[PDB]
Amino acid sequence: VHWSAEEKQLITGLWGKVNVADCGAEALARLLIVYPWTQRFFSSFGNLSSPTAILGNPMVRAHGKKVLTSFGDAVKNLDNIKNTFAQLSELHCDKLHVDPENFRLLGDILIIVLAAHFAKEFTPECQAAWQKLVRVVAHALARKYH
Amino acid sequence: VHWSAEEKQLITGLWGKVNVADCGAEALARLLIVYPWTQRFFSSFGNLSSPTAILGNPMVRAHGKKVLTSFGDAVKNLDNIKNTFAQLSELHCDKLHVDPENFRLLGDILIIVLAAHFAKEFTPECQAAWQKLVRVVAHALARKYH
Amino acid sequence: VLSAADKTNVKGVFSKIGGHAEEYGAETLERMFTAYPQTKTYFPHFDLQHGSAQIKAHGKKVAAALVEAVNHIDDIAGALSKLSDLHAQKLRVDPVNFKFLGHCFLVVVAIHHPSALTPEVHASLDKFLCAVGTVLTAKYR
Amino acid sequence: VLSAADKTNVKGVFSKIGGHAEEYGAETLERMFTAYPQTKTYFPHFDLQHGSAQIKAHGKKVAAALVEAVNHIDDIAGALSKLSDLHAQKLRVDPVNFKFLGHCFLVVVAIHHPSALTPEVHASLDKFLCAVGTVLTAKYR
Numbered sequence: 001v002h003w004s005a006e007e008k009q010l011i012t013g014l015w016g017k018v019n020v021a022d023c024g025a026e027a028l029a030r031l032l033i034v035y036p037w038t039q040r041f042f043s044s045f046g047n048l049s050s051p052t053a054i055l056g057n058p059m060v061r062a063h064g065k066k067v068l069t070s071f072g073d074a075v076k077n078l079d080n081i082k083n084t085f086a087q088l089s090e091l092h093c094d095k096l097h098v099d100p101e102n103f104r105l106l107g108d109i110l111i112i113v114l115a116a117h118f119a120k121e122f123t124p125e126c127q128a129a130w131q132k133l134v135r136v137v138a139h140a141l142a143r144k145y146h
Numbered sequence: 147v148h149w150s151a152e153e154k155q156l157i158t159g160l161w162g163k164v165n166v167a168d169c170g171a172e173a174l175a176r177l178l179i180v181y182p183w184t185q186r187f188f189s190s191f192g193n194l195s196s197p198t199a200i201l202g203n204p205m206v207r208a209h210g211k212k213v214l215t216s217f218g219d220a221v222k223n224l225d226n227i228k229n230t231f232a233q234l235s236e237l238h239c240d241k242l243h244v245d246p247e248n249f250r251l252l253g254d255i256l257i258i259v260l261a262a263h264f265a266k267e268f269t270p271e272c273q274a275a276w277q278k279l280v281r282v283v284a285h286a287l288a289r290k291y292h
Numbered sequence: 293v294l295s296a297a298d299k300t301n302v303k304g305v306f307s308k309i310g311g312h313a314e315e316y317g318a319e320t321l322e323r324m325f326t327a328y329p330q331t332k333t334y335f336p337h338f339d340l341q342h343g344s345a346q347i348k349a350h351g352k353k354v355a356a357a358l359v360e361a362v363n364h365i366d367d368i369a370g371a372l373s374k375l376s377d378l379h380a381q382k383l384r385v386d387p388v389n390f391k392f393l394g395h396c397f398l399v400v401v402a403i404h405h406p407s408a409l410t411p412e413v414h415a416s417l418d419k420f421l422c423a424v425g426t427v428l429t430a431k432y433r
Numbered sequence: 434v435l436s437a438a439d440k441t442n443v444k445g446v447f448s449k450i451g452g453h454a455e456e457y458g459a460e461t462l463e464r465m466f467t468a469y470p471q472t473k474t475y476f477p478h479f480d481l482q483h484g485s486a487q488i489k490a491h492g493k494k495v496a497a498a499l500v501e502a503v504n505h506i507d508d509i510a511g512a513l514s515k516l517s518d519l520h521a522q523k524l525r526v527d528p529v530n531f532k533f534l535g536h537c538f539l540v541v542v543a544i545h546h547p548s549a550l551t552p553e554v555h556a557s558l559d560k561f562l563c564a565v566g567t568v569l570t571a572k573y574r
């Protein structure tokens with residue numbers, strides 16, 4: 001992929017103001033609540049019975065944080081995303097057997113979470129810079145297929 | 147992608163018995179009839195008012211043939227699919243603006259058309275060998291994005 | 293949705309299948325596990341190798357539900373509401389898998405009844421399979 | 434489908450929007466054209482640059498339809514049947530674009546009303562947008 005200069009600036013800037021823990025937790029909690037079938041891959045997390053339980057589950061918060069920290073790694077090597085996520089592609093695909101359409105859903109939720117944490121600072125051009133990021137990361141993960 | 151030895155044999159064998167014209171025409175005619183919104187990209191083809199018209203339209207048949215001939219090129223360079231389709235990726239993406247989910251639909255129809263032309267000779271392992279082909283070609287086309 | 297015309301096509305192709313429904317339900321499941329390996333994840337308790345008395349036993353069940361939704365095509369939602377909870381609530385089946393099963397079922401009727409799966413009928417059958425898919429994942433939206 | 438609970442959430446978030454509906458309809462269209470460029474293809478006759486009196490004029494229309502489907506959430510299919518032919522028949526809009534518009538609308542209400550778009554409400558709103566999307570592409574299946 002080709003990363004325009006503004007895009008990098010837009011991606012990097014915003015990223016530095018991101019609360020990895022609160023956002024990661026919220027993004028993953030929403031995934032599970034809005035698209036319930038995703039709960040299937042997290043049985044080892046314990047109680048996900050109600051949304052209030054998913055919201056409080058210590059491991060959801062704990063995992064959400066790791067997921068967003070992972071995006072950070074992509075934000076540090078925009079030109080090297082394919083490799084940064086090679087091992088994760090094996091885990092999601094070969095180990096867990098997640099369908100790539102779900103990688104797309106999480107990225108879309110992340111975008112909505114970011115939008116709610118930055119308000120107007122999240123300009124249309126910014127949204128577009130992030131959609132793109134969210135996309136390439138999703139392909140980078142679904143590499144280990146076709 | 148990694149092409150097993152059986153897969154190549156399975157892909158190449160069947161391919162040699164394919165009627166590029168009749169199949170290509172049928173596959174594209176079905177695409178337009180089952181997923182009508184695809185008709186949008188073929189306004190330059192004239193009359194697509196009814197299924198019987200789409201079935202008879204000289205340019206649909208004429209184009210269907212070119213599409214399957216294109217798959218032939220992929221069948222000749224299984225290890226070089228990414229490149230074979232570089233220029234086509236520009237046309238579908240940058241020029242026509244087709245959504246990759248539609249590349250997936252055509253491949254799925256092609257699979258159904260092949261199934262109807264070969265009957266039992268189209269074994270489950272064969273279907274799987276072709277799904278894979280249809281997939282990588284679809285990604286090869288949607289390369290010019292992310 | 294399912295036009296009076298669509299309903300006719302579905303019933304038509306289902307009458308030419310009739311007795312074989314069961315055999316077709318097992319072949320569709322076998323192709324799914326072979327072409328879309330990731331679906332084997334939902335059947336850890338099955339003997340997934342070709343032939344298994346379970347895959348055949350289940351293939352019957354699947355076909356039966358289809359044949360039964362065809363007789364209530366005017367109210368598919370009610371003739372399958374029972375299976376919705378199992379699929380959406382307990383099993384938590386990813387919606388995409390439904391597209392897979394549907395595609396394999398078409399590949400099947402196309403191998404056994406090419407001349408019956410005319411582009412116009414294909415269009416109908418695909419709408420019918422989508423409905424079923426929807427009703428079975430209903431407890432999602 | 435749309436649970437009595439879901440219907441409540443939708444109406445709730447639509448009442449906190451109220452007057453701004455129009456402004457939000459224009460912002461959603463602007464983000465769509467910016468984040469999903471391929472959608473500009475359907476508006477060759479528009480001045481697609483930020484601000485255009487057309488994008489604003491249209492954004493009003495889109496928002497209005499939403500606000501009107503919200504008042505008939507019990508029968509969204511009938512309160513929009515008119516728009517179905519335009520979208521599915523004449524315009525032939527690829528179904529995917531509907532997911533895009535919906536996603537941009539959420540991004541909007543989330544920028545202006547974060548504390549209102551609670552994960553539980555998000556879930557509802559997304560079901561509601563999917564319904565609309567379905568009804569508008571109805572002449573497909």
Ligand code: HEM
Nearest residue numbers: 038041042044066067070071096098102103104106107138
């Ligand atoms: C598209 C963005 C995604 C990213 C960047 C991502 C990232 C990660 C990372 C970095 C780990 C943690 C590695 C570890 O500590 O072992 C992980 C684990 C995992 N991911 Fe993802 N993931 C993504 C999407 C998904 C989705 C969509 C699902 C399924 C709905 C999923 C399911 C899992 C599961 C279940 C685990 C391991 C659970 C465990 O170790 O107990 N991931 N993911």
Ligand code: HEM
Nearest residue numbers: 184187188190212213216217242244248249250252253284
């Ligand atoms: C996934 C497999 C596909 C392959 C291999 C494929 C292949 C081709 C090829 C080889 C050409 C002919 C080049 C030429 O003569 O100019 C072409 C042109 C084109 N394709 Fe595709 N295509 C695919 C999918 C699609 C889909 C899904 C659509 C849209 C529903 C589409 C729309 C078009 C259009 C409209 C043109 C050019 C029309 C014209 O030149 O008048 N293609 N495609």
Ligand code: HEM
Nearest residue numbers: 331334335353354357358375379383385389390393424425
């Ligand atoms: C239109 C397609 C489908 C139909 C008509 C259907 C129908 C059925 C029926 C009749 C049963 C319940 C039988 C019983 O009470 O024991 C069943 C069970 C089940 N279904 Fe589905 N199903 C469909 C799709 C799927 C898909 C796509 C998957 C997932 C890949 C799936 C996985 C299961 C599982 C795991 C069971 C349990 C079987 C057992 O434990 O023995 N089904 N389905």
Ligand code: HEM
Nearest residue numbers: 472475476494495498499516520524526530531534565566
């Ligand atoms: C839930 C989303 C949508 C709603 C509520 C909606 C609503 C409307 C309304 C009210 C009109 C008709 C106004 C009139 O009679 O002039 C309209 C027109 C139209 N819509 Fe949609 N629409 C939606 C999605 C889409 C999408 C996704 C596209 C395609 C990217 C689209 C493209 C168009 C076009 C091209 C027109 C014509 C406008 C003109 O020519 O001025 N719509 N839509």
